[PDB]
DNA sequence: ATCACAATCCCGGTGCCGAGGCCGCTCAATTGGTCGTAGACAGCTCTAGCACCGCTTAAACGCACGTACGGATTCCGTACGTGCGTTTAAGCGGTGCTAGAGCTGTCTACGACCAATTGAGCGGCCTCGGCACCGGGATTGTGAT
DNA sequence: ATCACAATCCCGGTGCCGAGGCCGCTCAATTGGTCGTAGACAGCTCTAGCACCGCTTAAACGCACGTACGGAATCCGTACGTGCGTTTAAGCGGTGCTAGAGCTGTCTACGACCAATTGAGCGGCCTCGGCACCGGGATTGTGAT
């Protein structure tokens, strides 16, 4: 067969992503989302096309910018596995969590 | 049924991007938690301009200025 | 035009309109729309510069929205200026933390 | 068909992006995001020259409210340069009165 | 000389808690918090409201600019108290 | 009734909210209920968190809000804690917590 | 004589101390360092005394603030002892640096 | 026309125990040697951004005396906002 | 190291659509002119910021000593990543259907602006009950045995 | 087990002074009238949001397999806590000095505002070169030998 060492491949995807700049989540299931939430709050609601492209622009901006940190915190902890822990302190951190 | 949407390897190349290695079982659901929180917080706010401009429509410019409010500013859209 | 008079490009006119217009305060005075727009064209100035060598470095001609991201977060005050801001289709700059290289 | 207007400062920084690269242009969305930048420097230096006339119970909006907002505003290097091209287009103004 | 006039909300935040306490009193320091946190959420509501005005070009700030930059502004259940308490007071304004 | 704030029936100053909000250049004009709402609300906060700090006084024994009965208040109630989080009340200390961690076993 | 075990007065001086409200930094030596950087800002500065109280409130609580922080990120790597790279890993992720 | 005396080091009138002090009422039990000057570190830095703000507030009303005032500005716009001080 | 084989890089060709330029209309900027008032400046007051000194004493310092903590080491189990094939719904280009966004033009209820009227809110003044501060005595917890 | 004892806690006593009330003068809020324009409300225009539809992939998914990572377990050295004696300077409160904060009055330069004017800046239109996409060699690492 062929088979690479356990973690080059993840190595090669983060080259790979931080080389990029496209969207990472696929846009439909993302749109039913913010309809689907945004429903919670007002009933009978239409987005715009770029509202729900300002908001997964934000949104996954916001998810690798906490990424980021989350693996400061497993780092800090000696480790290379991110676990909820470290996403729970860096939230803590940034004073979103109490 | 719909926050599952946001599927694993979604999840994956979002954490790619920020620089991660390994990623544990259970940040998969974590961060579905953490973005529903983040995407409520903004799309409340954005409906309340909505709202406001009494509009049936939610604009790019609502929230722009949700995003603004939360100190999460995005250029691009209409800033 | 106020914009000649003071060597900008950047319109001083409109700047004094958007002044008044903006609920700062009672008055505005003559200079302070001059200065302003100095200001702004300066600083579009300094982005575009480091955004159109970030548009060489990446063998292109036009600027998109990655080479102003890496204008912003390659410059020290750059990225401090627009910390709490997000530069649609920006991407990251590629950084991988040291102890996650095989050795 | 017909119209609808709305204003940016997509004319003045293609002029400046002339100045400093002429032989490179700029792709619509990256002219969204220069957009975005002027709008938001201009109402955070604003935001602050409105705040340091009513500390000081002033009416008035003068150069020196914009030039302390920059101060305030700007980092070090940042500031001093920019403190330099609102002085000076200033003076260039008042002395072609 | 004869000091200068230094306005202040010590009398209505006074009133306020005798009503709500009527045996408890309040130190220097306290009022002057109290004091900043009044003008602190003034500040940051007139503040939301004259945004939302300026985003929808309108030249006024009436009670439903108010209203929206209360509910931006407070948390929930705060929100929801200030709201009905505060349409209250418009209305017994507009009759009377 | 001759104040606005009886009118209103509020102990806070709708004529003075009335002028801050005009001498204060948030928009040309100010509606005849802003105030009046603005003015309301303010009081709602106020009694809210007097209600709590007093409560707080009488915990500790005293007849007298001081700085730390306000804190004790605010950093105790969920939404206060919120609306003042990037807040710093001079002289009111901190919650007592200790870590679990920390405790002798 | 007597001999209290390592943990136990810390203990009790963290309860004695969240009971308080007392400023921790003795007022003189608070004072001197701020005229001394101020002074390297602006040369004859003068201080109202509450402009020194004001700077030392905000100072001390910023230091509690962090100290939890700080706290919290020792704990996270399973240590009791607060450490420089604590303090460093709690700023950086305020975006402090 | 007089002189002050000249300062210098007054960052170690951070002392020690002050730090200490400090560290327990945000809840620490175990403090590391090198904790303090790291710590005198960053409260100088905090020092230095907020001074320089009050400064710029007290020379732009053309004064020779730093206020409480110009200080509670200085907090409120690096998003440190404190009461008990005016505003 | 020296071997082969992945996945990645880069290079010259190819079509495709938005960058960028001109075009002509129009609305926002400009110029030229009046009026009133914000604040620049000068003169005067008296607050409070500063310096300086001696005395008391609590806090800071530095040194002795040893506990319990951090880190270095081994070591074991499975929770992870990698790489197959099978399963799925995202993506696209398509036509069709209209809620509701958004622009105009009418007009009147509402708020600016004003003088004249006056009573809420201010500082000045005064005093005593709340609480900071202390010493006593009871309680409680940690560490010696 | 049991037992000092150090530290903390809870108690009235006691004395200092700031919360809080009384007063009376003043300035900001109220009163009633003009007058102008913001915006509500209505009427029309058509943009963009939205719905169901059917192929063509690439992305999602579920699974086999096994390794490197996390964590549990132990062991050693010394750093960091505690306590003590000695050393240092903060705080106090009491005095003496003037810089400069902050407030008044005078007068004018400057900006609001209006009417008239003009070209800078807008959308509409067009077209073409910068760049996305791709296939087929240039090269670079990764794992295996
Ligand atoms: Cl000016
Ligand atoms: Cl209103
Ligand atoms: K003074
Ligand atoms: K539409
Ligand atoms: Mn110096
Ligand atoms: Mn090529
Ligand atoms: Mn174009
Ligand atoms: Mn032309
Ligand atoms: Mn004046
Ligand atoms: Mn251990
Ligand atoms: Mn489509
Ligand atoms: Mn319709
Ligand atoms: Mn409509
Ligand atoms: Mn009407
Ligand atoms: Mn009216
Ligand atoms: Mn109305
Ligand atoms: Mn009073
Ligand atoms: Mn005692
Ligand atoms: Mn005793
Ligand atoms: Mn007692
Ligand atoms: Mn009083
Ligand atoms: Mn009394
Ligand atoms: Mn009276
Ligand atoms: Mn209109
Ligand atoms: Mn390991
Ligand atoms: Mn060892
Ligand atoms: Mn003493
Ligand atoms: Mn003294
Ligand atoms: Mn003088
Ligand atoms: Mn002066
Ligand atoms: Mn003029
Ligand atoms: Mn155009
Ligand atoms: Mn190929």
Known sequence: PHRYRPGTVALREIRRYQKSTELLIRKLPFQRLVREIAQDFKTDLRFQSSAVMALQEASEAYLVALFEDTNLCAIHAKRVTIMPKDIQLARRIRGERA | DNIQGITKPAIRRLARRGGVKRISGLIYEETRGVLKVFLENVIRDAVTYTEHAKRKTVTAMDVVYALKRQGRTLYGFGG | TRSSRAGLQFPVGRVHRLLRKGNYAERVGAGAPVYLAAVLEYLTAEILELAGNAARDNKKTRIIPRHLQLAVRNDEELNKLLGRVTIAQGGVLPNIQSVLLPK | ?97
């Not at chain 4, 940016?8 to 242009?25: E, F, M, R």
């Open chain 4, 1 to 97: 068909r017909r119209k609808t207007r709305k204003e940016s400062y997509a004319i003045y920084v293609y002029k400046v992006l002339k100045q400093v690269h002429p032989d490179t242009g700029i792709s619509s969305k990256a002219m969204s995001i220069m957009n975005s930048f002027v709008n938001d420097v201009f109402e955070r230096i604003a935001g602050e020259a409105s705040r340091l006339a009513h500390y000081n119970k002033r009416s008035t909006i003068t150069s020196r409210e914009i030039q302390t907002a920059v101060r305030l505003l700007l980092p070090g290097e940042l500031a001093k340069h920019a403190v330099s091209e609102g002085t000076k287009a200033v003076t260039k103004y008042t002395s072609a009165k």
